[PDB]
Design a protein around this ligand. Structure first.
Ligand SMILES: [Zn+2]
Length: 46
């Protein structure tokens, strides 16, 4: 559960809404799918 990213962490493609890193650009977009269309998810603000 605690943080623990050995190497894999700083990805060239990181979401700009949830901050989800992605070693590949395609992966990022394919993920943002949830950010587009249906209500957003994840932490936003207090
Ligand atoms: Zn995202």
């Amino acid at each position: 559960g605690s943080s623990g990213s050995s190497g894999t962490g700083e990805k060239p493609y990181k979401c700009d809404v949830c901050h989800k890193s992605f070693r590949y650009g395609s992966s990022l977009t394919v993920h943002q799918r949830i950010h587009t269309g249906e209500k957003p998810s994840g932490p936003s603000s207090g």
